[PDB]
Design a protein around this ligand. Structure first.
Ligand SMILES: O=c1cc(C2CC2)[nH]c(=O)n1-c1ccccc1
Length: 164
């Protein structure tokens, strides 16, 4: 069912995350981590202290889909185990901010065709698929977007709830 998911999303904040490729989303799904550029790192750290849940909704560039969504479990930190991200041309690992721990809520994909009825007030009511990395998605739009994803029966939200 969807009741524990709705509980996790209650009064959450939501951010669109772009990945240049599928490899980085695969690494994020396996290791429970993400890293963004410093401008977005500052926004996410502020949000993490501001709200009961901060949800990252992932989309690989040019894929026409979202690849899942996850909840921040920490502010960003430096000096942890190395992660062999595959970054875009002209970007080095030193340009990244720190590493956020994340707990995946759904590792299933959602094609953009299924979200065409949702618009984001914080991006001029453009379709929610449209946005730069780090674009905040307003609560109602973000909640409805997450509820569109296929249920991920491999995930037990009981432990995620205990972190809130
Ligand atoms: O492409 C990537 C790949 C990553 C991986 C470390 C996780 N993190 C990012 O933030 N980007 C990004 C998105 C939009 C604009 C500039 C960079």
């Amino acid at each position: 069912g969807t009741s524990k998911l709705k509980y996790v999303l209650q009064d959450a904040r939501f951010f669109l995350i772009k990945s240049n490729n599928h490899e980085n989303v695969s690494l994020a799904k396996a290791k429970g981590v993400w890293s963004t550029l410093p401008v977005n790192e500052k926004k996410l750290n502020l949000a993490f202290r501001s709200a009961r849940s901060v949800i990252l909704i992932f989309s690989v560039r040019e894929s026409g889909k979202f690849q899942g969504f996850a909840r921040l479990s920490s502010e960003s930190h430096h000096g942890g185990s190395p992660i062999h991200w595959v970054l875009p041309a002209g970007m080095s690992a030193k340009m990244l901010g720190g590493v956020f721990k994340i707990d995946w809520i759904c590792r299933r994909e959602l094609p953009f065709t299924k979200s065409a009825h949702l618009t984001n007030p914080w991006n001029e009511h453009k379709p929610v698929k449209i946005g730069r990395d780090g674009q905040e998605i307003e609560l109602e739009c973000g909640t409805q977007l997450c509820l569109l994803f296929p249920p991920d029966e491999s995930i037990d939200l009981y432990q995620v709830i205990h972190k809130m």
